[PDB]
Amino acid sequence: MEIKRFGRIREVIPLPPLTEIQVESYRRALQADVPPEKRENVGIQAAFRETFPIEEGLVLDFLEYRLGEPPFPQDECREKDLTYQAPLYARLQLIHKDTGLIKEDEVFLGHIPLMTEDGSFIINGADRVIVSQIHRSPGVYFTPDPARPGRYIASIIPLPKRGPWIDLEVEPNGVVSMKVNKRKFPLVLLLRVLGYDQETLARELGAYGELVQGLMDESVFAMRPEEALIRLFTLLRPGDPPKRDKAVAYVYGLIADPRRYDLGEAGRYKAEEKLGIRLSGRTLARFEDGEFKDEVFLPTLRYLFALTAGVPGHEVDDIDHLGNRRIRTVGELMTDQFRVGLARLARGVRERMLMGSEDSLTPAKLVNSRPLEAAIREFFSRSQLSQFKDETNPLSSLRHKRRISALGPGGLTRERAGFDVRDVHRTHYGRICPVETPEGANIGLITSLAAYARVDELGFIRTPYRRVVGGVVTDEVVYMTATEEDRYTIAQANTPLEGNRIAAERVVARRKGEPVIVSPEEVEFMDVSPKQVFSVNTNLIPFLEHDDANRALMGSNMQTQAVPLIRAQAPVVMTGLEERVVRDSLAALYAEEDGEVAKVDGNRIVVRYEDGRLVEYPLRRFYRSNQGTALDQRPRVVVGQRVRKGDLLADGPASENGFLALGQNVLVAIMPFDGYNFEDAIVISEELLKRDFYTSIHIERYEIEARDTKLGPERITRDIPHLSEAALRDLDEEGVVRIGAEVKPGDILVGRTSFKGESEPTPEERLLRSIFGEKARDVKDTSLRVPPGEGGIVVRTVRLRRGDPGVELKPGVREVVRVYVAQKRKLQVGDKLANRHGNKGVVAKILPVEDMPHLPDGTPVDVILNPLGVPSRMNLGQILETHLGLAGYFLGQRYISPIFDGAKEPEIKELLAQAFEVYFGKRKGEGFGVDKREVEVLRRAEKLGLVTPGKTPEEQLKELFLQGKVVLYDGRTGEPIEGPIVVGQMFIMKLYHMVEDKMHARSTGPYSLITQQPLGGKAQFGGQRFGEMEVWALEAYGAAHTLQEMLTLKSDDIEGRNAAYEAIIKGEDVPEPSVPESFRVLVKELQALALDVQTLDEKDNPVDIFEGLASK
Amino acid sequence: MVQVDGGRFATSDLNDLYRRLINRNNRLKKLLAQGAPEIIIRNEKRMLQEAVDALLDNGRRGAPVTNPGSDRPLRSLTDILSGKQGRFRQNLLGKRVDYSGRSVIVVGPQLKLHQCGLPKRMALELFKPFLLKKMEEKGIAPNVKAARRMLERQRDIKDEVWDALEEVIHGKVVLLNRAPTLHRLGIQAFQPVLVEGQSIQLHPLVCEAFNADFDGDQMAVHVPLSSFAQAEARIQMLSAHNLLSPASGEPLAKPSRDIILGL
């Protein structure tokens, strides 16, 4: 079908690589393709440069490092539960000061995990993503004292865990105070240690009235820097003997040493830009020529005093301004942990240097890599910023890599996060999405990167703009930080243009975010596209300008939850971003150069390019994702087809012809239907199921292990004690279910037997033994069985054994078996559907095709939405999408309507007018006139004022069709709906929340260790929690026995629950409940606290709830 | 100290605290018997006091005791008793219960005010011990254990047991509860109607009282066991029985949305 597109705005530059925030960063940090001598001071190189040389004698220094090739490819890592990584070798040299002997060697430091092509990692077999972390950019900031109106606070901030924060304040009494590690002291002392004299401070700081006088302490200047140093040492470290070199070491380590105190390069740059100075290093002070030389403190105090004085050219710092906040990407986050492990490694080096033979030692015997390996592994495994990859559909992964978190180590803790932090700043424009963010506790803390946004080497988010020179818009594109942005008057992208000249006398623009109308001479820059303002997901919503932000949020977030469908279709109305998403997600397979297709198969595609070389692209087929969705590629080309560079070869999951297909295009009608769509509920047609729309393949992985026990080994076998052939039917000779066998709850996936514990059989068991005549068997049936509510066809099996080549399990484990079972899920009642406009709802009914409302020509609708969802949510987009859809149904064409440069009303009116001819004129040519029912509907519409009275019925039907409303017949009666109904094609997705997964129920089951109460979760077959508030509900109802049942028989009362089950299976009434076990636990735990808790009768005598068990 | 599934061991932090205390007490005793100097015995006694402190309430005084290479403060008895995760609030004032379940809710329009659609698959498990006895009362199973072993495999389930389940739940009611439960109407008693499919059918009129809509909200179900609990549920807690808000005294079950629209 034809794709007709709209919009008058020409995008000058395309979207930058969407995953580059991960890829470019990590590549920048590793520098594997850069020759060791040309490597720069960033990354693990930086870490090596900071850590080494290691002194104390012997001096161990860093020569170079290298990264080897992965010992295993990505897929093999995924299957064998390994990590995709490269070996890290380090060439270092041991140098003796006295001897002079130089022993050089290359030691193996362990492996560094490698990032894949798409920007994710493979850690222990599972795909993971390192989420970028926003925080306050280090530097020197000045903020108004909340308590004191006319005074300010100076703040000196390094990188996280790079050393202490420092606060400079002007005290009420006039003295300048400094806070380090929650200790206040006069700044005069430290300044004296830095070598400052009353002369210097007087001539430098004298220009401000009386401010410098508080910095004047005659007793401090009376002593040389040494006495001031020891004095300061006794101030900061009471009880510590004030030896000189100890004080030197402390003050150096705190304020000076770059190995301890480290500003970021962003911190250095911001300090230089703000204070107006030039920093030698990244540290506040230096140790040079045996003394302390200041860097930061004096200019900072100068700025503080100048600001306090009211000197022009001094401003307070908005700390939520994006010029003051930076992003730590994957490279930086990994680099820091590498640095930590490296410093620990250094501690190990020194510790092993002091001991042992001082003669025979090599870098191999000195260096222990374990702390480094442990640091990195701990980072990629247990960090909060390291998240299990969401692969549900390509857009899920793509978005997940673009996430920005204020949480995690070094960042905010919840309930440390105010309203200021979570707010949308004016500087978020073009940088962070104003729309996309989680509902609930994480709002403002978790966000997403803007489409055109870029993160520079300093960590600040930059957005592209176009240079405008004298009313002429150039093609020059400048990526700016927020600070830079604040300098110019920036026109909006939708401003009228004749060629490159501004066509309007009055132009809408922004000055420091403040909206203003200006003249074309004043325009310095211009927005590239509206698209730069919103994230990738938000950019996939057509008619976004017609949707309320609150619902736009949900629509944006729900596309991440869309399940891949076997029939999946690209939307009828797209935004034009649908292809780039599939491309940059690397889900689809593309042709490298020009060439001809040699071979097309289900499992592979062979292409011969212009080079003449034969390239074979294997196709990923039915691979289970992390979220359990099937990810597989299907061939889009035929044998002998001529293809160009970048042309589509195979379609990935949730993809149609290189376009993003998150769902189906269905014919919907907006109207209440018999309370089945009541309150967001959704009615669907059975014909949706007939043609396999909203049908998705899901694969689940089941696993089981057989290990060595002190009671004897477990083993996977087909021999399972006391089981019929009917039970063992689908099991092979080894005891594992055969491929292609159907499995239902209760079926055995992998047979396993375990040696029973030391068991004293009750006389009854022995009696049964003798009775049946079969001797007691040594083992018992532990076999892995299909969980309740699950099942499918077994697609795959994997068996890893000890003693097999290339196979090594964790210690003690004999064997490990995996079973991949797949199922084809149709759309059922309880499954959740949503559109892109934030309209979400569960399918509440599936009607047969005859009950469904239908068009006059016999065409039934697929889905019935409720109009009551529209007016409160204020998302009108879904309405327009439907209208343009309607035309698209009859004209047989799709559409691209970019955000904020869209198809407007009159255009859709024209398109509907064209579609009406195909809809009606066909009927007129088939020899059919207007129906009586249509006449009645047109009468009611005349009374509704929806059509102009007096016109011919055809003209009125046209007038209705231009409003997107048509005559609809009730499937049951045949009588038309009493008014015209909005009908048309809408794009709807099936989300990941499916009733098949969520349905759970429990009678009895596993109990908790200490509390003896039911476990939680469906996975554990646990019970529902009856919390404080539910108990409050029962109490308010005054149902005492129900509540007591909840508190005793149904949870922790063991005698009570056993007797209850036994009484129920015997058909009698449930027994009186007894004391719950958790109260006993409470009593004993209170006793361990040395408090005696006694249960008493009315006569004040002890009552024993332990029944003499705890009493001697 | 219990061996988990994987064959490894899991143990409480109280064991480590007790270990510290015991070790330091033993060392104190030995140091006493060996005639140690003053300062040593002093430091040892201090350490003992801080070990008892760590055991009873950890982090109360000074920096909290942690495990080697870990920043996680160990859990003392005090931490066990109090707090949001404390024994009181977590395991006493509220509990996890047997004979319960949950699922996604869908609106039956066709239910009477006192009814709710209950999936057969759920009711099977919820009412299970009754269904066993019923299967014993009929010829469906030789005895109780045979009946229970019968329902373990889904393919071993015939049609008559479903009718047995129909006979089991007759007249009885369940409890529907949607979190959060703000007032007492967050739990209501409904006479269940067995439905095909995996979703709970909920009556439209109780929605507003539950504050429940169809966008994917889920509900929990509970089964009162006793004749007494059933009496309380049916008489007091029945949906059709409470028509008015205990707050304002105005009707809490009233026409809304589509209904008001049509009327």
Partner: peptide, 14 residues
């Protein structure tokens, strides 16, 4: 305050 610092102080007395 800090047990270790206290012990180190009591040690510096002798």
């Amino acid at each position: 305050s800090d047990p270790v610092r206290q012990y180190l102080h009591e040690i510096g007395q002798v």
